[PDB]
Write an enzyme that holds these catalytic residues in place. Structure first.
Site, mmCIF file in Angstrom:
data_model
loop_
_atom_site.group_PDB
_atom_site.id
_atom_site.type_symbol
_atom_site.label_atom_id
_atom_site.label_comp_id
_atom_site.label_asym_id
_atom_site.label_seq_id
_atom_site.Cartn_x
_atom_site.Cartn_y
_atom_site.Cartn_z
ATOM 1 N N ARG A 12 31.172 51.855 45.627
ATOM 2 C CA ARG A 12 30.421 51.072 44.661
ATOM 3 C C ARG A 12 28.946 51.123 44.985
ATOM 4 N NH1 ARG A 12 33.761 48.498 41.473
ATOM 5 N NH2 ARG A 12 34.479 47.104 43.131
ATOM 6 N N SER A 100 33.791 46.872 38.447
ATOM 7 C CA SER A 100 34.583 45.671 38.639
ATOM 8 C C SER A 100 33.987 44.458 37.899
ATOM 9 C CB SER A 100 34.832 45.422 40.141
ATOM 10 O OG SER A 100 35.640 44.278 40.261
ATOM 11 N N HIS A 101 33.568 43.410 38.624
ATOM 12 C CA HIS A 101 33.019 42.193 38.015
ATOM 13 C C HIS A 101 31.492 42.086 38.224
ATOM 14 C CE1 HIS A 101 33.540 40.800 42.263
ATOM 15 N NE2 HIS A 101 32.353 40.284 41.998
ATOM 16 N N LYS A 110 37.486 53.589 42.200
ATOM 17 C CA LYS A 110 38.736 53.153 42.849
ATOM 18 C C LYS A 110 39.666 54.365 42.806
ATOM 19 C CE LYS A 110 38.034 48.323 41.761
ATOM 20 N NZ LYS A 110 38.592 47.076 41.163
ATOM 21 N N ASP A 234 38.720 39.607 34.665
ATOM 22 C CA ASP A 234 37.493 40.183 35.160
ATOM 23 C C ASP A 234 37.136 41.435 34.390
ATOM 24 O OD1 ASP A 234 39.140 42.102 36.434
ATOM 25 O OD2 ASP A 234 37.903 42.144 38.228
ATOM 26 N N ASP A 236 37.174 44.572 34.717
ATOM 27 C CA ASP A 236 38.028 45.765 34.645
ATOM 28 C C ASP A 236 39.513 45.456 34.466
ATOM 29 O OD1 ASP A 236 37.861 44.986 37.384
ATOM 30 O OD2 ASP A 236 38.528 46.901 38.118
ATOM 31 N N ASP A 238 41.791 43.879 36.456
ATOM 32 C CA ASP A 238 42.723 43.806 37.581
ATOM 33 C C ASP A 238 42.779 42.420 38.213
ATOM 34 O OD1 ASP A 238 40.326 43.948 38.876
ATOM 35 O OD2 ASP A 238 40.733 45.709 40.033
ATOM 36 N N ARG A 239 41.985 41.492 37.698
ATOM 37 C CA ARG A 239 42.016 40.100 38.167
ATOM 38 C C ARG A 239 42.181 39.157 36.995
ATOM 39 N NH1 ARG A 239 36.578 38.798 40.427
ATOM 40 N NH2 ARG A 239 37.640 36.850 41.040
ATOM 41 N N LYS A 277 43.010 34.397 52.654
ATOM 42 C CA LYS A 277 42.293 33.344 51.927
ATOM 43 C C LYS A 277 43.207 32.382 51.166
ATOM 44 C CE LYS A 277 38.849 34.822 49.420
ATOM 45 N NZ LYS A 277 38.231 35.778 48.438
ATOM 46 N N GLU A 317 46.292 38.027 45.949
ATOM 47 C CA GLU A 317 45.105 37.583 46.635
ATOM 48 C C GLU A 317 44.496 36.359 45.975
ATOM 49 O OE1 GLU A 317 42.494 40.603 48.365
ATOM 50 O OE2 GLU A 317 42.904 41.651 46.499
ATOM 51 N N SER A 319 41.573 36.007 45.187
ATOM 52 C CA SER A 319 40.594 36.447 44.203
ATOM 53 C C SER A 319 41.209 36.673 42.843
ATOM 54 C CB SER A 319 39.918 37.742 44.639
ATOM 55 O OG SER A 319 40.884 38.754 44.852
ATOM 56 N N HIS A 321 43.684 39.184 42.181
ATOM 57 C CA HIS A 321 44.436 40.425 42.142
ATOM 58 C C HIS A 321 45.901 40.071 42.431
ATOM 59 C CE1 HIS A 321 40.982 43.288 42.189
ATOM 60 N NE2 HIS A 321 40.433 42.509 43.099
ATOM 61 N N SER A 415 33.231 39.770 54.638
ATOM 62 C CA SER A 415 33.389 40.432 53.352
ATOM 63 C C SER A 415 33.213 41.949 53.543
ATOM 64 C CB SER A 415 32.347 39.901 52.357
ATOM 65 O OG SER A 415 32.276 40.732 51.198
ATOM 66 N N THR A 417 32.565 43.743 50.694
ATOM 67 C CA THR A 417 31.835 44.109 49.464
ATOM 68 C C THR A 417 30.402 43.655 49.461
ATOM 69 O OG1 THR A 417 32.480 42.119 48.177
ATOM 70 C CG2 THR A 417 33.960 43.966 48.161
HETATM 71 O O1 G1P Z 1 34.319 40.644 49.535
HETATM 72 P P1 G1P Z 1 35.748 40.668 49.981
HETATM 73 O O2 G1P Z 1 36.244 39.287 50.326
HETATM 74 O O3 G1P Z 1 36.004 41.611 51.100
HETATM 75 O O4 G1P Z 1 36.695 41.221 48.793
HETATM 76 C C1 G1P Z 1 36.692 40.656 47.488
HETATM 77 O O5 G1P Z 1 36.725 41.751 46.508
HETATM 78 C C2 G1P Z 1 37.961 42.550 46.440
HETATM 79 C C3 G1P Z 1 37.857 43.520 45.228
HETATM 80 O O6 G1P Z 1 37.906 42.587 44.171
HETATM 81 C C4 G1P Z 1 39.228 41.698 46.380
HETATM 82 O O7 G1P Z 1 40.334 42.566 46.594
HETATM 83 C C5 G1P Z 1 39.204 40.608 47.457
HETATM 84 O O8 G1P Z 1 40.328 39.749 47.291
HETATM 85 C C6 G1P Z 1 37.918 39.792 47.292
HETATM 86 O O9 G1P Z 1 37.918 38.670 48.217
HETATM 87 ZN ZN ZN Z 2 38.425 43.849 38.940
#
Ligand code: G1P
Ligand code: ZN
Length: 455
Positions: A12, A100-101, A110, A234, A236, A238-239, A277, A317, A319, A321, A415, A417
């Site tokens: 990303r 994604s979001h 992905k 979200d 895309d 997937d959430r 989480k 998850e 989040s 997913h 994290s 991301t």
């Molecule tokens: O930033 P994190 O916590 O590693 O990851 C975050 O983004 C990912 C992609 O949506 C999800 O799979 C995780 O559940 C979410 O907590």
């Molecule tokens: Zn997504």
């Protein structure tokens, strides 16, 4: 190419900055080369509804073609629909071009190769192939595949709602609007659409149902229209996020309680995965129904690997997913998960508020985030794992440090991301919540007395 776009779960970046047309091409080359190395010439390619989709997807496809791959171009689809294609077409490889979001200028990849979702050192391996010129050359091909109708019918024909429901559906101007409202109606619902026009400018709220502020409009509409349920997707697809008929947010860990009951009822002893989480109340609930609770690392790609390793029939998850293997394929899919939720709710005489309120609840924090640095976040966690004292509790270090106490739990993790530490706390009482927060505050300060402790 910049190393920073190659992340734990996927790739990303920001288009015009760290992600260009040329880097999409070479990423396509790398993925095609890896797929061929695993014996899979056939690769599905999808994109979400972002502004940069058309430009980057053409390059991604050319990169695959220039390896000798046979590409199946499924066009603009939700992420789970691309995963579906990589399960039902000839090939078991697939690439989804999505941000994604994230805000409009973000995009990414992905990646599934020969059935496996790539993560960690496998994503780095792609970067390394490009640097090394360890890349296949060949004359591949592209075929257009219109896969959405197949996906639609696959779901519609296996979901059996027992009564009609009225549902508000908030797509957040993301790609879920190509199917979610249409499919939910076809299940036997009335649907009130919110932000269901696909618009890569995301002019309303960002399509991130994990934040309460992005569910404000959904909650208001559910109440105004006396709807049975609200659903949010979200960007895309997937959430998923969920709101009851009275406006209560059902966080995904408690959604998973309902799903776990459903899946385990037909599959005694089934493994059910959830990330670190998620509420401790899941462990007991899954065990009580005779399932095997498996706590695992946060991150969609990591959860997917774990479902292969364990044979789990369901994963989720915090989040949002959610990953059904039972009656399905094992990948995360907000749209399919919404259908499964509607099926269960439609067979209950009670309203959705009462279905969910029956399950135990604890007092929970909102997610806490502390910004550190990308190059220090992992060392902070390592230092806690080496040095920290947590008192009496069940300590898990599979992802950061989680401690489960008799009356509550706490978590600190990095994290993958963003450059942040992520914390959660839950307990039976406010007093226990504060006790646990104090333990974590003091262990953080022992590692680095300068760390922010904004909780
Ligand atoms: O930033 P994190 O916590 O590693 O990851 C975050 O983004 C990912 C992609 O949506 C999800 O799979 C995780 O559940 C979410 O907590
Ligand atoms: Zn997504």
């Amino acid at each position: 190419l910049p190393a920073s776009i190659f992340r734990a779960y996927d790739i990303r970046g920001v288009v015009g900055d760290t992600l260009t047309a040329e880097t999409a091409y070479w990423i396509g080359r790398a993925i095609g080369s890896e797929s061929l190395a695993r014996g899979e010439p056939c690769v599905a390619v999808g994109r979400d509804g972002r502004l940069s989709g058309p430009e980057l997807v053409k390059q991604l496809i050319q990169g695959l073609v220039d390896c000798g791959c046979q590409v199946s171009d499924v066009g603009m689809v939700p992420t789970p629909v691309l995963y579906y294609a990589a399960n039902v077409l000839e090939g078991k490889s697939g690439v989804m071009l999505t941000g994604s979001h994230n805000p409009p200028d973000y995009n990414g990849f992905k990646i599934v190769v020969a059935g496996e979702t790539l993560a960690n050192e496998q994503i780095q391996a792609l970067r390394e192939r490009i640097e090394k010129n360890d890349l296949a050359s060949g004359v591949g091909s592209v075929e257009q595949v219109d896969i959405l109708p197949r996906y639609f019918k696959q779901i519609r024909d296996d979901i059996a709602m027992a009564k009609p429901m009225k549902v508000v559906v908030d797509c957040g101007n993301g790609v879920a609007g190509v199917i979610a409202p249409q499919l939910i109606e076809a299940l036997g619902c009335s649907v009130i659409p919110l932000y269901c026009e696909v618009d890569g400018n995301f002019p309303n709220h960002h399509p991130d149902p994990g934040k309460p502020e992005n569910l404000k409009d959904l909650i208001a509409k559910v109440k105004a229209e006396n709807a049975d349920l609200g659903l949010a997707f979200d960007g895309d697809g997937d959430r998923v996020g969920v709101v009851t008929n009275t406006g209560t947010i059902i966080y995904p860990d408690r959604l998973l309680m309902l799903f776990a009951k459903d899946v385990v009822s037909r599959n005694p002893g089934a493994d059910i995965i959830f990330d670190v989480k998620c509420t401790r109340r899941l462990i007991a609930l899954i065990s009580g129904y005779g399932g095997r609770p498996v706590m695992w690392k946060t991150g969609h790609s990591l959860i997917k690997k774990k479902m292969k390793e364990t044979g789990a029939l369901l994963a989720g998850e915090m989040s949002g997913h959610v990953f059904f293997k039972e009656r399905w394929f094992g990948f995360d899919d907000g749209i399919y998960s919404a259908a499964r939720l509607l099926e269960i709710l439609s067979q209950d005489q009670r309203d959705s508020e009462h279905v969910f309120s029956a399950f135990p609840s604890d007092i929970s924090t909102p997610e806490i985030n502390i910004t550190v640095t990308e190059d220090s976040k992992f060392a902070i966690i390592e230092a806690l794992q080496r040095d920290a004292q947590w008192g009496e509790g069940n300590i898990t270090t599979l992802d950061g440090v989680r401690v489960d106490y008799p009356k509550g739990w706490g978590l600190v993790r990095a994290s993958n991301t963003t450059p942040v530490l992520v914390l959660r706390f839950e307990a039976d009482t406010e007093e226990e919540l504060e006790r646990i927060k104090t333990v974590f505050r003091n262990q953080l300060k022992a590692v680095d007395s300068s760390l922010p402790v904004p909780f």
